[PDB]
Write a protein that binds this ligand. Structure first.
Ligand code: HEA
Ligand code: HEA
Ligand SMILES: CCCCCCCCCCCCCCCCCC(=O)OC[C@H](COP(=O)(O)OCCN)OC(=O)CCCCCCCCCCCCCCCCC
Ligand SMILES: CCCCCCCCCCCCCCCCCC(=O)OC[C@H](COP(=O)(O)OCCN)OC(=O)CCCCCCCCCCCCCCCCC
Ligand SMILES: CCCCCCCCCCCCCCCCCC(=O)OC[C@H](COP(=O)(O)OCCN)OC(=O)CCCCCCCCCCCCCCCCC
Ligand SMILES: CCCCCCCCCCCCCCCCCC(=O)OC[C@H](COP(=O)(O)OCCN)OC(=O)CCCCCCCCCCCCCCCCC
Ligand SMILES: CCCCCCCCCCCCCCCCCC(=O)OC[C@H](COP(=O)(O)OCCN)OC(=O)CCCCCCCCCCCCCCCCC
Ligand SMILES: CCCCCCCCCCCCCCCCCC(=O)OC[C@H](COP(=O)(O)OCCN)OC(=O)CCCCCCCCCCCCCCCCC
Ligand SMILES: [Ca+2]
Ligand SMILES: [Cu+2]
Ligand SMILES: [Cu+2]
Ligand SMILES: [Cu+2]
Ligand SMILES: [Mg+2]
Lengths: 265, 547, 42, 260
């Protein structure tokens, strides 16, 4: 801006947003198609386009930060936005937990609601909380510590080998969660269709497994940035959001773990 | 400024707001015309228009015949056409007409100006909100033309999509409608986050949160409620989607599901939605009342805190839309009692408005007529709600037309009044061309008259037992349906006037050259700029005394 | 007239500080309410 | 035939009071209506008054006040005491209608797409009720010579088309009937204006309602919850008769004939 007195970030035009909205129209219309006997090709196109848009858009986000556009308030604007994003995330889960706690409390049975049935559902076999469950909660707690440790080092010691070390370690353990989580599905004692327990069980940990993967990918991109030297102790916003996010993922799992595996057995 | 560059890759919050206005305007007419359809068909008993025999004809063929009466004898009652109409209205209106104009048009464009901010915190992401609003619309409309219930097209379910009718309805119509609401909820959450970082981070020096315009405060509270409510609706509608395409059983009794739990998680967002619509309307009213009564808005803090009072109560009263679905008496009292409390907050607002007017000299320009209409009709609408808040009286009133009149008074004679109040009030500022004081007055009078005829009769019908979502009705309900129907054609006429008034204006409208074309009492930062505003408003930040 | 970074951000930092406190206040007030309800009526 | 509880051309009021809950609903609304007739009027009168008393040619110069503590207080307590008042007279009516008595009769209502299912568990009686124009009776849900005639033979008239059913639920005056409503497929809702009672029929749930008729006659209700295409076409008909005929009804209904 020719003669400005302010640090906020004003931006050149940008096509990205339109593109990703067509992608998503096509994605979801094709996704409807594919759930109704027709072919996948239209849905994967959508996602291919959306993913293209997402990578540009975020590439340019760093780009712009390297152009020094990320002034003191600009970096605070970003941090705040992102924090509303995790508050939105938290409310999304509130819907998933709300179902699990209601059916777990007032289970449907023939005189419902005068009289409630039984939970867990007749003939459902809940998993053992201390054999695999605890394994995956120790795997996340662990990674959490490992990822925070890369955060601290960078900001507090400015140590950059350490920083990438904690990242790698955290990244690989986030993928392990997924592998172990997949194992659980393999060995499930109930089904997904036909029974509340399966719907709630699976959609609930199902949405949490989504996020882990988004988590683990996010950190991967920090490792990459960190390898090309993209972070300083004063400027390090992707880093702050990843660590905050990772931690949300873990806080959601922990409550799942105590809600669904520990309390509801 | 290639035309493609400007509107298709927008980064400026004042062009993105213009986009949401026309866009919302568009879909409002489309939606609006489906209402004429219904009113033609409800004008008179028996089914004359929505006949089953028109299905044989291609769509291009049967369509045109449907705008012309058939004899009862040769008319074959196709209830599904009705059910699809009633739900295109509902879904278009509550997701694609009013929140987009009032929140993303007049809020995106102006909230920023009012705080003395360059632009919006996240420009790219805002443009992305605009375009995902299109996707949803598109998907929702596409839905009318795709395979749907009973071998016809279109999902005739309810704008709230309750199962197990929503799950069992055949086709994929209701899948497109399900994902339309998803995109519209992303739309709203992206917009919501943007307006929340911007207002608390991008205010001008010395502008404390108690020194911010009320219009901006209303977009602030609105934006909070969206953030906390749409994600809960992404979940209840993801449970419809799974139960239809992955044979889950959330609201399917054969697998231990509960249709009622759907109603709780939908209304926990279905209540916050109605305050999300009228919040912005309360903010534009302030402005218009301060401005045209030539006097400071009375009780500014209590107006700001009333706002936050409503939105917070708005998340704890949602089973009032379920009094007859099967709830405990305890549940019925908690929710009746709790809903009653929002009356304090709103009244304070209503009195302060009458008070501002009190003691000042009033200029009955077009923009003030709407504000005064709204003062009256929103109260009419409001009262009703208290009657409906009473669990006991709701038995009879539930699912009858006495609710339909509620919601249209405080929606069609309420927040819609705020959509036009803001239109007339800020058309020059955003266009460089003012409108005709005479045509504006005519419009106002037309639609107040029409729209009172449209829904006042329905209070009767509701007391006389007419059920909701019928395509036909008894002989005893003809009288008042005629009246209503007459009323809606009178109101549809008006909306046509208004689009010509607007068209004219942006064509041959008075060139505006002043920076404030109203009066000295219009004291917010938008009136300190040209007339049509610079493309980069506030490179130089608003000096503290400037306003 | 470039001077990236030299703007005054005192007001925003104090604002964020309140924001972070107010949200925590909220969150925990709901949870203990949710809990209350649970105990009284569940 | 005494057709009481039914719509009345050009009617703006309620349906006749055939029971104690309806009596009270009518009284609860009345009272509530005046208190908000008062407020509505009252709110217009200031708007009007102020618009004219303070129009710019009547008072050229504006005032600058923005707060009047006393007044604010008044306007926030007044409505809060108004609301308590309504509470006093409203919770009580709620409790009477949702606190269910000892039955003297018991029916079970089950909404099925495009008809109702009635059962009297104590007397071993089960039948169904369909509108007279249902495709279940020859028509397409619209008036036709056949339709007209079929209703005349029922005991109804051309104008009660969409409300009369082929099978009526019979009932004894002065007796408490508890209706347990459940839905069989999608949701439905079973009411009777004249009784002041109404309740949704939801798949997987047993909801109860009670009612007592002080007088005899034909009372009509109508599906109340978007259930499909023939949402408009699933009337409800209730017949309240004396107790001596009710018993007779029991016996006559055991041979498979389900009409009175
Ligand atoms: C806020 C949105 C909204 C609006 C504006 C309207 C406007 C109108 N609606 Fe309604 N309507 C609903 C939301 C709305 N409606 C909903 C949610 C339902 C229930 C759905 C369901 O049952 O599932 C419903 C139901 C409904 C019904 C009965 C349904 C039934 O049988 O169950 C009827 C009955 O005739 C009706 C009539 C009308 C009429 C005549 C108008 C108007 O045409 C009359 C006056 C208003 C205008 C004349 C024009 C207003 C135009 C705008 C405000 C445009 C905004 C854009 C710009 C300014 C650029 N509507
Ligand atoms: C802008 C939209 C809007 C707004 C603001 C409101 C506001 C209110 N609504 Fe609602 N409502 C709808 C839109 C809205 N509503 C819609 C669309 C539906 C139907 C949904 C569907 O089922 O499809 C609905 C449905 C609905 C129902 C359920 C209907 C049913 O049973 O099917 C109820 C019942 O509790 C209710 C209550 C209220 C109340 C108490 C208010 C209050 O907010 C009003 C408060 C205002 C006042 C109280 C007047 C101002 C106060 C004073 C002037 C003080 C003086 C007066 C007194 C103290 C009494 N509304
Ligand atoms: C199976 C194998 C298939 C593999 C295909 C993989 C395709 C690749 C897709 C991966 C996406 C890459 C993500 C990168 C985003 C991070 C951008 C970033 O860090 O820059 C943003 C800015 C950083 O600035 P700063 O850190 O201060 O720079 C310091 C330099 N001095 O910090 C910011 O501005 C903060 C911005 C935060 C980013 C938002 C993230 C939240 C999104 C979560 C939504 C989930 C969507 C997932 C997709 C599902 C499909 C719908
Ligand atoms: C019951 C609640 C449970 C809900 C789950 C939410 C869990 C939150 C996730 C935790 C992640 C925090 C990770 C901290 C490690 C490294 C990052 C960090 O320490 O940032 C500290 C930051 C201080 O920020 P500051 O120093 O002010 O920066 C510029 C100041 N001018 O302080 C911050 O701003 C940290 C921001 C991250 C917040 C994530 C999202 C918050 C969502 C609201 C959660 C509220 C939880 C309620 C807490 C109750 C406490 C008893
Ligand atoms: C992110 C990591 C951590 C995890 C994040 C998510 C935490 C969420 C934990 C709680 C979320 C909501 C859980 C609510 C449980 C309610 C259980 C329930 O359904 O109660 C029953 C009642 C319906 O029962 P009914 O069938 O009508 O009665 C039959 C009885 N014979 O149902 C009702 O009447 C409704 C009951 C109350 C409604 C509460 C809904 C509020 C949801 C928002 C919660 C916000 C959590 C705040 C997060 C703080 C983080 C900073
Ligand atoms: C009802 C609930 C439904 C849930 C859906 C809600 C949203 C889903 C959409 C996915 C993408 C949203 C991620 C939001 C990130 C928010 C964090 C934040 O504050 O990011 C700030 C950054 C600002 O971007 P910018 O305007 O370019 O600022 C430049 C400053 N350097 O912002 C960014 O980094 C922008 C990156 C966006 C990438 C484009 C992707 C579009 C995809 C839309 C599909 C949505 C479908 C969601 C379905 C939910 C599934 C259950
Ligand atoms: C019991 C059930 C309840 C139901 C749920 C409740 C939902 C509520 C949604 C309503 C949102 C509106 C909140 C408005 C807050 C207004 C407070 C305010 O502005 O106080 C002024 C204070 C003073 O700052 P001052 O310096 O004087 O002025 C600015 C000069 N810079 O300013 C400050 O210190 C700045 C504070 C910023 C405002 C904070 C906004 C966050 C509040 C939202 C809570 C979110 C709850 C999250 C729960 C889900 C968590 C997962
Ligand atoms: C890593 C280590 C982690 C370990 C974690 C350990 C801690 C575990 C945390 C557990 C928290 C779970 C809370 C679950 C809540 C259960 C309460 C509940 O469901 O009660 C419902 C209540 C009674 O339901 P009802 O059907 O009457 O049952 C009666 C049977 N005689 O329903 C009623 O009485 C009806 C009254 C309804 C009143 C609604 C009140 C509103 C509720 C809160 C507001 C929600 C709004 C949120 C806003 C957020 C936005 C800011
Ligand atoms: Ca007709
Ligand atoms: Cu509500
Ligand atoms: Cu039905
Ligand atoms: Cu129905
Ligand atoms: Mg209903």
């Amino acid at each position: 801006a020719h003669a400005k007195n302010h640090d906020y970030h004003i931006l050149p035009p940008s096509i990205w947003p339109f593109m990703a909205s067509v992608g998503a129209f096509v994605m979801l219309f094709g996704a409807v198609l594919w759930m109704h006997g027709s072919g996948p090709w239209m849905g994967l196109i959508g996602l291919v386009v959306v993913l293209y848009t997402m990578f540009g858009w975020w590439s340019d986000v760093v780009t712009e930060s390297l152009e020094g556009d990320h002034t003191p308030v600009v970096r605070l604007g970003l941090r705040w936005g992102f924090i509303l994003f995790i508050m939105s995330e938290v409310m999304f889960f509130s819907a998933w937990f709300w179902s699990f706690f209601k059916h777990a409390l007032y289970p449907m049975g023939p005189e419902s609601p005068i009289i409630d049935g039984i939970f867990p559902p007749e003939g459902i076999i809940t998993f053992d909380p201390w054999h695999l469950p605890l394994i995956n909660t120790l795997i996340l707690l662990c990674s959490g510590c490992a990822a925070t440790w890369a955060h601290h080092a960078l900001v507090h010691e400015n140590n950059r080998r350490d920083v990438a070390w904690g990242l790698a370690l955290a990244i690989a353990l986030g993928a392990l969660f997924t592998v172990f989580q997949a194992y659980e599905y393999s060995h499930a004692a109930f089904g997904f269709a036909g029974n509340i327990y399966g719907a709630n069980f699976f959609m609930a940990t199902g949405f949490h497994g989504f996020h882990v993967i988004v988590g683990t990918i996010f950190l991967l991109v920090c490792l990459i940035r960190v390898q090309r030297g993209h972070f300083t102790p004063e400027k390090h916003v992707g880093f702050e959001a990843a660590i905050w996010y990772w931690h949300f993922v873990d806080v959601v799992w922990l409550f799942l773990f105590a809600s669904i595996y520990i309390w509801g057995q | 400024r290639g035309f493609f560059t400007r509107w298709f890759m927008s980064t400026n919050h004042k062009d993105i707001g213009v986009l949401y206005l026309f866009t919302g305007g568009l879909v409002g007419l489309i939606s609006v015309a489906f209402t004429v359809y219904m009113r033609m068909e409800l004008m008179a008993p028996g089914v004359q228009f929505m006949c089953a025999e028109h299905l044989e004809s291609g769509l291009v063929k049967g369509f045109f015949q449907s705008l012309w009466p058939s004899a009862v004898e040769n008319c074959t009652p196709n209830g599904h056409l009705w059910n699809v109409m009633i739900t295109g209205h509902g879904i278009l209106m509550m997701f694609f007409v009013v929140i987009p104009a009032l929140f993303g048009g007049f809020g995106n464009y102006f909230m920023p100006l009012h705080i003395g901010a360059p632009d919006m915190a996240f420009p790219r992401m805002n443009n992305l909100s605009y375009w995902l609003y299109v996707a949803g619309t598109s998907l929702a409309v596409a839905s009318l033309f795709a395979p749907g219930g009973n071998g016809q097209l279109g999902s005739g379910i309810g704008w709230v999509l309750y199962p197990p009718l929503s799950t069992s309805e055949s086709g994929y119509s209701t899948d497109l409608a399900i994902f339309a609401v998803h995109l519209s909820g992303a739309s709203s959450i992206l917009g919501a986050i943007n307006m929340i970082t911007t207002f608390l981070n991008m205010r001008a020096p010395g502008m404390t949160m108690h020194k911010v315009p009320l219009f901006a405060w209303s977009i602030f509270v609105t934006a909070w409620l969206i953030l906390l409510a749409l994600p809960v609706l992404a979940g209840a509608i993801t449970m419809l989607l799974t139960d239809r395409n992955f044979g889950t059983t959330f609201f399917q009794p054969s697998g231990g599901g509960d249709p009622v739990l759907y109603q709780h998680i939908l209304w926990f967002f279905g209540h916050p939605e109605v305050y999300i619509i009228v919040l912005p309307a309360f903010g534009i009213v302030s402005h218009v009342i301060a401005t045209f009564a030539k006097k400071p808005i009375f009780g500014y803090l209590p107006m700001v805190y009333a706002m936050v009072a409503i939105g917070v109560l708005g998340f704890v009263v949602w089973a009032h839309h379920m009094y007859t679905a099967g709830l405990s008496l305890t549940q019925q009292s908690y929710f009746m009692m709790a809903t009653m409390v929002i009356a304090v907050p709103t009244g304070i607002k209503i009195f302060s408005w009458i008070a501002t007017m009190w003691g000042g000299s009033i200029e009955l320009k077009t923009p003030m007529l709407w504000a005064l209409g709204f003062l009256f009709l929103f109260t009419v609408g409001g009262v009703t709600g208290i009657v409906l808040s009473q669990a006991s009286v709701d038995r009879y009133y539930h699912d009858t037309y006495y609710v339909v009149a509620h919601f249209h008074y405080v929606m069609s004679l309420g927040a819609v009044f705020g959509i036009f109040a803001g239109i007339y009030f800020w058309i020059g500022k955003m266009s460089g061309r003012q409108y005709p004081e005479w045509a504006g007055k005519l419009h106002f009078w037309m639609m107040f008259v029409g729209a009172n005829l449209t829904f006042f009769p329905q209070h009767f019908l509701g007391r006389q037992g007419m059920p909701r979502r019928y395509i036909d009705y008894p002989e005893a309900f003809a009288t008042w349906n005629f009246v209503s129907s007459l009323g809606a054609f009178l109101s549809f006429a008006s909306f046509l006037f208004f689009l010509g008034v607007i068209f004219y204006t942006l064509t041959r409208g008075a060139r505006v050259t002043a920076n404030n074309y109203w009066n000295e009492h219009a004291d917010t930062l938008e009136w300190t700029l040209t007339s049509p505003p610079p493309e980069h408003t506030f490179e130089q930040l608003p000096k503290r005394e400037d306003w | 007239g470039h001077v990236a970074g030299s703007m005054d951000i005192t007001q925003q930092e104090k604002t964020f500080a309140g924001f972070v406190r107010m949200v925590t206040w909220a969150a925990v007030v709901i949870v203990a309410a949710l809990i209350f309800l649970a105990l009284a009526n569940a | 035939l005494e057709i009481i509880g039914r719509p009345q051309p050009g009617g703006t009021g309620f349906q006749p009071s055939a029971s104690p809950v309806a009596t009270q609903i009518h009284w609860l609304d009345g009272f509530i209506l005046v208190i908000i007739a008062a407020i509505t009027i009252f709110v217009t009168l200031l708007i009007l008054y102020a618009v004219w008393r303070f129009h710019e040619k009547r008072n050229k110069v504006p005032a600058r006040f923005t707060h009047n503590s006393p007044l604010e207080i008044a306007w926030t307590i007044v409505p809060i005491v108004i609301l308590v008042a309504i509470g006093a007279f409203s919770l009580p009516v709620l409790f009477n209608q949702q606190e269910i008595p000892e039955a003297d009769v018991t029916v079970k209502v089950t909404g099925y797409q495009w008809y109702w299912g009635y059962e009297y568990p104590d007397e071993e009686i089960s039948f169904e009720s369909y509108m007279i124009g249902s495709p279940a009776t020859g028509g397409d849900n619209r008036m036709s010579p056949e339709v007209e005639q079929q209703l005349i033979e029922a005991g109804y008239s051309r104008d009660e088309f969409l409300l009369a059913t082929d099978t009526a639920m019979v009932v004894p005056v002065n007796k408490t009937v508890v209706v347990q409503v459940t839905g069989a497929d999608v949701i439905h809702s079973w009411t009777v204006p004249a009784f002041g009672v109404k309740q949704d029929a939801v798949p997987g749930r047993l909801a109860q309602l009670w009612f007592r008729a002080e007088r005899e006659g034909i009372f009509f209700g109508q599906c109340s919850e978007l259930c499909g295409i023939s949402h408009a076409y699933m009337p409800i008909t209730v017949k309240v008769v004396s107790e001596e005929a009710y018993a007779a009804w029991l016996e006559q209904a055991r041979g498979g004939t389900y009409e009175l």
